[PDB]
């Protein structure tokens, strides 16, 4: 794996600079025991400059999130249904990174905001990485990408004070849902308890998103990624959910980093609603239009596998 | 002040960043139910600009909140100082500043506990200066080198990035107790002024010793203080948690309110100022920025007044994007040898270019200077000027000498204070003066209230409880034990460990004026304070009660919140969203005594709001003669501190801001025997 | 405009930072005066901080180029074709800026590079900006953008050594050219003297790709840009312009600079082809495809207007270094086409402006900025330099009242898509067999050359292809030229020792078409601005003389005119050790100085009568006024553009038709 390559240890060892010469880095060098501080004290400035480019730009929206490593394992040989090669034998095993996010707060935001939440999955397959990039909640706000702006910055802070964080309980995100009503299902959805889920553990992921499955012979089916959780599903109450958000801000990194170490690693079934390319509208709406699900009454659930997240991270930055 | 740059939007058509009228709502497509086009050019450049909007969070102080205002200059300070800015009697110089946390990110809470940061640009006629200090005199660590050590342990764990705006966790404390310069600071922390009441309410200093440096060459010592005009106050700790939950925006949003409603803060700026000569004549040294000088040996100096008067327009490009430096200094004054100070001047100029991604961050409208510059800084990403000299090196004759030298003897340059020298060997040690720890936090402890120390035993008792490390938690009792034994058995007692043996070393039982919060006295002034009266629909006499009692309170400048089951005119807040942490006093009004079950809010909360606001210290009552029936649901006593019943609106009104001016009554919390 | 506001003024005052403070950049702060260097100096910081970070990474291709401004002026009232408003009134002037360029070099590379050239230009219309990105050969080397990593990849040195800088000249380029036959009409262009032009000022512009005008009817018309040349088209020849680049790889932005500050600013007349919608693929070709031309027996230039370039910039790297062109920079009234070329250009220009800039707030840097107002929700990004007052920056809102508003074709004068464009079939990854002729163009190409003009490029081929070392690479290089013209085929094999393939005649034809040929475009129809240097001596009185009297004659006609001496003096302007006869466009020796082309320490040995004998074999109208220094030179008197006359004005008359003539093709060698 491309991440054990790349672990360093320091669990012994004198310390050294970037390029291995040993050093210290606990007084700065000067003219003097009382002096100024010397210019060339390479060891000071490269200590500093390092720390004072430690950040990068957080994520323009889900900046606020945790990961887990896992395992995908396939429950059959899905040839019938798709060329994919991650899904062509029974026991087939796929490494994976989860990350579980909010969608508004800046990264040092309250996990237990109201909230769309990511829930975004890579599988590192053997013919390459496929991600599926999903929300806990199956439609979205709006019917078209070049939306997305307007979407967030509506929702976001006030950009005069930068107030409120992480929330839509302010002026402009009621003005963009009321006067662009695509947003009435996501927004009915968050102002259900999946705004508010009691661990990124009790809620399920959704593509969103109709996509293909294609065989090699050419021939495409459409379908729906739902992702099943196998902890239930689970909620807070609001005020409960407040109180939370000031008393540990950290509340879903944490449940999720505990259940892993505790041998109690999240599981969900991935699974698929898989209809014909001529039952586009046939369920009395447009299977391109993201703001509508298709009911399960119409189409019944497919499982392909099992997802199970059973690893913490070793540097949080890094992965 | 920076209208040059304003860009307003509120008429005509959509324009691409080239002046090209176009539409932003829907993808072109290859047919109605198509693909999207590559040439969709109107889709690239707007996804394309959101895509990056984001720029690296600062390293430190990531979360905080700026605004515009003045300093004013009481005097001509031309003896002690050549500082252009303090040259006359009324001489005014624009100002920005931000205050901020200093271990949280983005969006993290305003009322964390931590040391605040209070950074303030004047925008001189002879160039920008930045004093960038905290609301704490003092600072954890002796040198510059160590800043990164500080703060990775203080900041989240780097496996799982827990916890949060917090030094409640292992490796915070077991750097304390490692590294006991930290001590001096760490008291400070633990005290009401980690959970300021808003940026108004808390002091800003320089913490440093820099120096002021006359025309003539001479110079002397001196120490930053900005003394808040609107009085110190703190939150509780309990009430703290609550509100960074109810309200992460608490800090800026108080500001805000304030300078929009015609309140805008004022500090009077100081120094204490002393000779070059007593560097070592206190008892400590003045180069170690984990020191105070005790007022009772320098008084303050008030230099000026600051105000601050006007919010941002845009708050990415304003408050975001300010870069502050202490390198930014003027004619007039000159750094100290402080090994922090000194590594600061490398930090702050170098971090700019991670954040703006590019040389030029000092051509952002925030950042430019008033007056014109000359030099031959040239090119780089982002370069903004078009430079007509093309000959910019010197010494030149092909443009006639210019820009010219600017030095002590011409030109009104900066200079080094002449009288600075160094000796002895190249070194990385540290000066022996440095040594003692644990005299000042000491000192500090003594200057406290007793239910400040109280207060300050139970942060400690709170965070250390979460140490997971039993070394650590021994380590940090050997430390508290060396400032004071009695803080170390107090502490000891709720993790279950003993105290070591007392070590006298460095017990003492000296004060100093000026550090305590609760000791203060009232607030000087009750103007801004928020005062929330509980009331109800169901009957139309407690809002004619709320009414009346609202007329009379915002006539003195407080901001009233009234507060019923739903809103209609006259009610601003419902009960479901009313929380005790938004009131600095709560009066219910008797008409709504029956509230004290519905689907409009959570069960017991108009009495969780009462029972909150009196458990937290603040200003409690209810007006109209009828009392007990609340008083008694509450478990308040009529007879208490800071308790009132009165009939009539005005007499209530004058004994309850008094209250308001007292801010706290400290009787309501339990010490330790 | 944007520009005037941002000058900054340095010729009085006292040096400051950055934030206004005075302060001293000569000597750093030490702790005493043998002593370290202090890190509290604030002022060495930040001068040598914006010093180590002056550099920005130079353009991923046609790095190497040079800019000024001007202005276009439209012709007439073009609403009866366009609904563009920079062409909606006759005398209606945009301010322009235009930037020149080569292709492959890095940013230091000679300007006489062999290499096919850019031509960008800047309209800030009273609409928006619009940028025509093009060059000066009128087709491109790909179908399709996607390969345009290949194509450069290709050109650029071989990547393990970096070798060679800014030339086709190795086995990669001509291992792509031989392996993807689309590249065999744009290799003509380059082979042709078009690959090595005289300036940018006579060479023309092209578009290259099909547009659409589409008028506020929303009816729409396929158009080809053309800028063509007021000064005339003229080129180097290949070992001219090799000297050149060691001389002075600068030549061609100093000709620039030098003509605009002389009053002498180069004008282009601004011309489309324009044809129906239904004419797409009546021309025997299919106008999707970038590596086909109109020819102009097909379809007439309309002139549009005038453009012409009349200051230079103020600062280089603010202005040239810093502006950002971009085919999606387009207005109102024009259109894109489904050329698969152009079609990704789009992508890659908005692309790669973040690499050089850093950030996404290019469009604010003052080059850039459009001349009209800003109205739009963008908001934020590093480098950020407005601050906005709309506090609602979403679309719908009531909370700014609607705006700003949405503009389209109905309302606010909106960019709108050509409401005729359609799509129709699958979604493919195929190639349209209407773009497969690779080689009938190239042949027109071929035969619209002169003789000479054809034995010019047919030794470009010679030159660059015996370098390729690999015989297989050469040998499919050969199979490639042999399908547009046996004969090209044969006379380059006949140079690397290989046999050429036999004739394959499937594309085989003698057409010709006008407008192509370099050398068949007749006399230059100004010679103002060319160079001419008049060899003297300090060693004879007459000499210096005779040089002054034919410097006054010769600068009344704009001609700029060095004399060449052994040393500096009064009326010489340049030494025999500094000066080549690439140095100008037409050589004089003035008799008194026979004795030097008979040894000095003042100059190489031989090099007065090799600057004379070079001009001659490179065309050069050349001249003794007052021969021995005929005779020492070779030069047969009688020659054309060989000048004798004892008589000044009668030299000056016959001199002067000879720089209009500009270059003797008869002093060089054909085949057979
Ligand atoms: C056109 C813009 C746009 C639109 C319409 C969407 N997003 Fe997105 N999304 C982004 C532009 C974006 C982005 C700016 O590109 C982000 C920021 C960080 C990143 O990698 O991509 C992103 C991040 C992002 C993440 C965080 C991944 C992580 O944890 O690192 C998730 C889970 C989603 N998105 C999910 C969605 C879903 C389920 C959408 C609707 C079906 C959706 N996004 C629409
Ligand atoms: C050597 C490293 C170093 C050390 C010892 C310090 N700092 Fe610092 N500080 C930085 C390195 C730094 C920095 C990484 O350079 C920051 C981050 C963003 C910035 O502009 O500078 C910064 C930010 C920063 C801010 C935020 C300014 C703003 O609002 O934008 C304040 C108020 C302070 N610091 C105050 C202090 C005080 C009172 C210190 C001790 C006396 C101190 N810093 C020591
Ligand atoms: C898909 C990639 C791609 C393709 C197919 C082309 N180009 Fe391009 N071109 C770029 C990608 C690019 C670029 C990487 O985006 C550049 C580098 C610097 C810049 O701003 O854009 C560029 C620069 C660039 C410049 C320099 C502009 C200036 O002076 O700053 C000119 C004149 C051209 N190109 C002209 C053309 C012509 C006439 C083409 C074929 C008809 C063409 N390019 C195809
Ligand atoms: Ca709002
Ligand atoms: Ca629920
Ligand atoms: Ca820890
Ligand atoms: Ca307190
Ligand atoms: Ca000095
Ligand atoms: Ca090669
Ligand atoms: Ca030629």
């Given at each position: 794996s491309?991440?054990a ?23 700065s060098?000067?003219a003097?025991?009382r ?5 060339e ?15 990068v ?7 606020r ?5 896992g ?21 087939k ?10 969608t ?9 905001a ?21 929300n ?18 509506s ?42 889920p ?16 294609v ?21 807070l ?5 407040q109180?939370?958000?000031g ?15 505790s041998?109690?690693?999240?599981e ?5 609603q ?5 039952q586009?509208?046939?369920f009395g ?9 298709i009911p399960?009454?119409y ?8 997802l ?5 991270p ?6 | 002040?920076?209208?040059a ?16 009228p176009?539409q ?20 690239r ?5 959101f895509?990056?909007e984001?720029?690296?969070?600062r390293?430190v ?5 700026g605004?515009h ?15 252009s ?11 920005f500043?931000?205050?901020s ?12 506990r931590?040391?605040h940061?209070?950074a ?14 905290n609301?704490?005199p003092?600072?954890?660590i ?9 703060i ?24 304390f107790?490692?590294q006991?310069?930290?001590?001096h600071t ?8 980690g ?5 108004r309410?808390?002091?800003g ?5 820099f ?8 110079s002397?010592?001196?120490?930053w ?5 609107q009085?110190?106050?703190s939150?509780?700790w ?10 992460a ?12 409603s015609?309140?805008?803060p004022?500090?009077?700026?100081c120094?204490?100022?002393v ?8 008892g ?19 230099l000026?007044?600051?105000?601050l008067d006007?919010?941002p327009?845009?708050y990415?490009?304003?408050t ?8 930014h200094?003027?004619?007039?004054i000159?750094?100290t ?23 030029n ?21 982002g370069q903004?000027?078009?430079?007509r ?13 210019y ?11 900066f ?8 000796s ?29 120390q ?8 709170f ?21 004071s034994?009695?803080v ?18 460095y ?10 919060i ?21 009957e ?13 309170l ?23 969203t009313?929380?005790?942490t ?17 689907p ?28 007990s ?7 308040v006593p009529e007879?208490g ?33």
């Open positions: 491309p991440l390559a790349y672990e360093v240890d320091d669990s012994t060892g004198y310390l050294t600079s970037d390029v291995g010469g040993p050093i210290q880095d606990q007084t060098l000067k003097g025991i002096g100024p501080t010397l210019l004290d390479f060891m000071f400035r490269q200590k500093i400059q390092h720390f004072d480019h430690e950040r730009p957080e994520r323009a929206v889900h900046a999130g945790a990961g887990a490593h395992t995908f394992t396939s429950y059959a040989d899905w040839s019938n249904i798709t060329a994919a090669s991650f899904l062509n034998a029974t026991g095993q796929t490494p994976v990174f989860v990350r579980f996010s909010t508004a707060g800046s990264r040092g935001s309250a996990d237990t109201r909230d769309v939440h990511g829930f975004a999955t890579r599988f590192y397959t053997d013919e390459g990485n496929f991600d599926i990039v999903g806990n909640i199956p439609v979205f706000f709006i019917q078209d990408a070049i939306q997305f702006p307007d979407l967030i910055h929702v976001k802070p006030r950009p005069d004070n930068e107030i409120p964080q992480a929330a839509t309980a302010h002026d402009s995100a009621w003005d963009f849902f009321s006067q662009q009503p695509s947003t009435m299902h996501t927004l009915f959805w968050a102002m259900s308890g999946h705004g508010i009691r661990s990124y553990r009790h809620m399920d992921g959704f593509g969103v998103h109709t996509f293909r499955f065989k090699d012979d050419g021939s495409s089916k459409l379908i729906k990624w739902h992702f099943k959780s196998r902890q239930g599903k689970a909620s109450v609001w005020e409960e959910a109180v939370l958000s008393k540990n801000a950290d509340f879903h990194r944490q449940d999720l980093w505990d259940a892993i170490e041998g109690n690693g999240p969900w079934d991935v699974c698929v898989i209809v014909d390319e001529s586009a509208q046939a709406f447009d299977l391109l239009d993201p703001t509508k699900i399960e009454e189409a019944p659930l497919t499982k392909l596998g099992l199970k997240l059973d690893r913490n070793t540097n949080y930055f890094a992965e | 002040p920076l209208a740059y304003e860009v307003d939007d509120s008429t005509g058509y959509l324009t691409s960043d080239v002046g090209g176009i932003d709502q829907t993808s072109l497509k290859a047919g109605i139910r198509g693909p999207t086009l590559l040439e969709d050019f109107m889709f450049q707007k996804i394309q600009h895509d990056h984001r720029v690296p969070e390293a102080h990531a979360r905080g909140a605004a205002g003045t300093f004013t200059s009481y005097a001509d300070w031309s003896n002690i100082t050549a500082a800015f303090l040259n006359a009697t009324g001489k005014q110089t624009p100002v500043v931000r205050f946390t200093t271990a949280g990110s983005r969006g993290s809470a305003d009322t964390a931590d040391v940061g209070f303030t640009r004047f925008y001189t006629d002879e160039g920008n200066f930045d004093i960038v200090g609301n704490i003092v600072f954890f002796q040198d510059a080198i160590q800043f990164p050590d500080l990775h342990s203080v900041k989240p764990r780097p496996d799982n990035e827990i916890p949060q705006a917090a030094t409640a966790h292992d490796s915070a404390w077991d750097f107790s490692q006991p310069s930290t001590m760490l008291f400070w922390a633990m005290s009401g002024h959970i300021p009441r808003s940026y309410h808390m002091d200093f320089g913490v440093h010793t120096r002021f440096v006359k025309d003539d060459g001479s002397k010592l001196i120490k203080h900005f003394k808040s005009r009085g110190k106050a939150l509780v309990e009430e703290a948690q609550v509100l960074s939950g109810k309200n925006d608490f800090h800026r949003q108080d500001l805000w309110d304030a300078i929009e015609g309140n805008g004022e500090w009077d700026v120094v204490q100022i000779d070059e000569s007593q560097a070592q004549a206190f400590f040294d003045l180069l170690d920025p984990t020191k105070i000088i005790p007022e009772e040996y320098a008084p303050l100096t008030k000026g007044l600051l105000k006007r919010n327009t845009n990415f490009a304003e975001e994007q300010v870069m502050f430096q202490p390198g200094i003027v004619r007039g000159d750094f040898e402080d090994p922090l100070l000194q590594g600061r001047l490398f930090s702050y100029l170098d971090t700019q270019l991670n954040r703006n991604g590019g040389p961050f000092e051509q952002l409208p925030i950042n430019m200077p008033r007056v014109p510059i000359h030099n031959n800084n040239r090119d780089g990403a903004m000027f078009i430079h000299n093309k000959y910019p090196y010197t010494p030149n004759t092909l443009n006639s000498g820009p010219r030298q600017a030095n002590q003897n011409a030109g009104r340059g200079f080094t204070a002449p009288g600075r020298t160094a002895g060997a190249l070194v990385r040690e540290v000066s022996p003066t440095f040594n003692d720890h644990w005299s000042q936090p000491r000192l500090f402890f003594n200057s406290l209230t007793p239910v400040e109280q207060f300050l035993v139970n942060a400690m008792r965070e250390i409880s979460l140490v997971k490390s039993e070394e650590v938690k021994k380590n940090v009792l050997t430390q508290l034990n060396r400032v034994h009695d170390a058995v107090r502490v000891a007692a709720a993790i279950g460990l003993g105290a070591p043996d007392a070590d006298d070393t017990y003492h039982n000296n004060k100093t004026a000026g550090v305590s609760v000791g203060s006295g009232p607030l000087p002034t009750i103007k801004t304070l928020r005062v929330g009266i509980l009331a109800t629909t169901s139309s006499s407690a809002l004619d009660q709320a009414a009346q009692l609202r007329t009379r915002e006539k003195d400048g407080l901001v009233v919140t009234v507060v019923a089951e739903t809103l209609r005119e006259g009610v601003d807040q419902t009960y479901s009313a929380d005790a938004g009131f600095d006093g709560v009066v219910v009004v008797d008409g709504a005594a029956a509230l004290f079950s519905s409009l809010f959570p069960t017991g909360r108009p009495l969780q709001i009462f029972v909150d606001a009196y458990r937290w210290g603040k200003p409690v009552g209810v007006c109209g003669g009828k009392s029936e609340v008083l008694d649901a509450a478990d007879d501190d800071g308790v009132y019943s009165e009939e009539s609106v005005d007499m209530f009104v004058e004994e309850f801001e008094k209250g308001l001016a007292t801010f706290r009554f400290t009787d309501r919390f339990a010490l330790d025997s």
